[PDB]
Ligand binder design. Structure first.
Ligand code: MG
Length: 631
């Protein structure tokens, strides 16, 4: 291995590529490499890399469109990072027609002297819409969506009601006024909340979680497919769930006024919002109400109709609000640190675009879940039990250096010395809030942050300013949370003197070697789901702008490159490119650290965060890209 690197090939539509381990792959090297290959590589000069061998080749389902040249069929990949055509012999056409979207299995990889060859294994057709975009995204990103037969068989024997035999031995919380608060369109209720004032100060908080590990035991078909998926995937009006709906919307979901098994984190909180204690136990509950964020917020604002309808719960909802206010302040004391809302028509296409409104009902659930997440992480960390922590690393030295150089030119500084802490960034964010360039500085700060991941090494969570954090409260839709419930049940039994590695209600002890693999896989699945949903969102946004060619929009420069700058349209969350060739004729200089394109003769300056107006010049539906002209 010295000195090799295992990495994944990332193609580029222009013929060259990259190795994700940042290494560059020449155009000639990419004649035998395929976007998605897993390889062993060696570094060269400047940083270029040479491929030693292909460890896991990319052969799986390639989505593209079918055409013919001189009677020879071929497929143009939909993902232009697969920057080659695929010949299809005439007996492997499966009855595809010109322009149809098809799915290909490679039979010959491309080489320097020959083109790739494949066979069409599925024909999707020419009816391009939201359903088609989802179908393409599932296949391109290899998201599992077909239920294995063994999963269907495992689930066939499930009763609709929890049997009394399952409730025996559990803490009875059915008289506790636990409630669920979720979006109107949600059907998989992972969590329920209740809190009381604590005698002498503070609060006692119950966070009750769907007891997924009771229903999904290790190595069963349900477990193997849940790990395979890694997470639920959320498309427009359509969920690809990690678990079959009979569990995720039924027995696991904490539905109203029905007895349900749950795993409970019961916590004490000080009058200043500090977690002072926690315990975990299996219980049975009965949700007193299925509420929405909108209803709860209106209740807290004083809405008469809702406070009459839910009068027996109003005091309990107000107490969660009181607790939240102090938890929010505790997050501030700790070190602290806008989204599109698609309105769809009946055909799952965008009718209009709104800005999501986030209110105290969203945030009180968020802070309650964070407390349970902290409690679960501290529980497994103190026990030295192999588990996935939800970690968020410090910003890179290079990102801090570039950020401080941008700040210094403005007379600003990032406090905290050479290794600033979350509170230092939060202090800087406060200081710049009212500046005209606050959005530019916030964007630069957030873009210096690393991406959060699942990892069995607890390196802390920078963004939340937490020493120990782990995802515990959504085991219906995240595989890491499922494994954490298993570890907690295993530890609870061990504290009672139990000596086995499993528990009759679903506990399980994992090895550190398993957890290393699981962290990489589950972090992969999280990113994979995000890229697929973004693909579909890109298609919907381009479809929405198709009839806007020629029209003018206000926007903000969202990224600057040597070939132009991208602009995000105000209130629409839609991006497009102002190419440098569309600007006034000049010699344009690119400042990378300043994120600036400067015209030498004109003195004109287009910088990240600048407010502009752009005209929609073109919408390319095949590439899902929009072209702008400035002014
Ligand atoms: Mg929920």
């Amino acid at each position: 291995h010295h000195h090799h690197h295992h990495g994944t090939v990332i193609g580029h539509r222009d013929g060259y590529g990259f190795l994700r381990v940042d290494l560059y792959l020449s155009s000639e090297q990419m004649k035998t490499c395929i976007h998605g290959d897993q390889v062993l590589a060696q570094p060269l000069g400047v940083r270029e890399a040479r491929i030693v061998r292909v460890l896991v080749p990319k052969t799986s389902q390639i989505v593209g469109r079918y055409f013919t040249e001189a009677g020879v069929g071929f497929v143009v990949p939909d993902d232009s990072r697969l920057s080659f055509d695929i010949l299809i012999p005439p007996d492997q056409i499966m009855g595809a027609r010109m322009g149809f979207v098809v799915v290909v299995e490679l039979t010959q990889r491309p080489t320097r002297r020959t083109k790739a060859v494949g066979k069409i294994v599925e024909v999707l057709g020419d009816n391009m819409g939201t359903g088609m975009a989802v179908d393409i995204a599932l296949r391109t990103h290899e998201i599992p969506y077909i239920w294995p037969q063994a999963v269907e068989q495992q689930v066939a024997g499930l009763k609709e009601e929890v049997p009394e035999e399952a409730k025996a031995g559990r803490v009875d919380l059915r008289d506790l006024p636990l409630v669920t608060i979720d979006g109107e369109d949600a059907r998989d209720f992972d969590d329920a909340v209740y809190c009381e004032k604590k005698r002498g100060g503070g609060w006692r908080l119950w966070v009750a979680i769907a007891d997924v590990s009771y229903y999904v035991r290790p190595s069963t078909p349900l477990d193997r497919e849940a790990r395979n998926r890694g997470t639920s995937v959320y498309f427009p009006s359509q969920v690809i769930p990690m678990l079959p709906e009979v569990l995720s919307n039924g027995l696991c979901s904490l539905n109203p006024q029905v007895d349900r098994l749950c795993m409970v984190c019961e916590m004490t909180v000080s009058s200043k919002g500090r977690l002072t204690g926690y315990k975990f136990y299996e219980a049975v509950m009965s949700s007193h109400a299925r509420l929405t964020y909108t209803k709860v917020w209106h209740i807290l604002q004083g809405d008469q109709d809702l406070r009459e309808q839910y009068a027996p719960l109003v005091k309990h909802l107000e107490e969660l609000h009181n607790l939240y206010k102090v938890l929010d302040k505790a997050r501030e004391e700790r070190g602290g640190i806008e989204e599109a809302k698609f309105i769809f028509n009946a055909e799952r296409r965008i009718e209009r675009i709104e800005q999501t409104q986030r209110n105290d009902a969203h945030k009180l659930i968020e802070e309650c879940m964070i407390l349970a997440n902290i409690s679960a992480a501290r529980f497994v960390e103190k026990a030295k039990e192999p588990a996935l922590f939800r970690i968020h690393d410090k910003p890179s030295t290079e990102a801090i250096t570039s950020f401080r150089s941008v700040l210094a030119e403005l007379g600003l500084e990032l406090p905290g010395g050479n290794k600033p802490e979350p509170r230092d960034y939060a202090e800087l964010l406060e200081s710049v809030a009212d500046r005209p360039d606050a959005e530019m500085l916030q964007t630069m700060l957030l873009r210096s942050m690393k991406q959060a991941i699942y990892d069995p090494e607890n390196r802390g969570h920078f963004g939340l300013a937490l020493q120990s954090y782990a995802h515990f409260t959504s085991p219906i839709r995240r595989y890491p949370d499922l494994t954490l419930h298993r570890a907690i049940k295993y530890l609870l039994a061990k504290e009672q003197g139990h000596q086995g590695n499993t528990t009759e209600t679903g506990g399980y002890h994992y090895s550190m070697e398993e957890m290393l693999q699981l962290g990489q896989h589950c972090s992969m699945a999280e990113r994979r789901a995000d890229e697929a949903t973004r693909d579909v969102a890109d298609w919907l946004k381009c479809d929405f702008m198709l009839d806007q060619v020629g029209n003018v929009f206000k926007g903000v420069i969202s990224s600057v490159t040597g070939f132009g700058f991208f602009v995000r349209l105000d209130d629409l969350f839609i991006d497009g490119l102002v190419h440098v060739s569309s600007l006034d004729n000049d010699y344009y200089r690119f400042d990378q650290v300043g994120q600036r394109l400067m015209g030498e003769s004109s003195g004109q300056t287009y910088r990240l965060g600048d407010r502009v107006e752009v005209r929609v010049e073109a919408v390319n539906m095949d590439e899902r890209k929009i072209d702008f002209s400035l002014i």
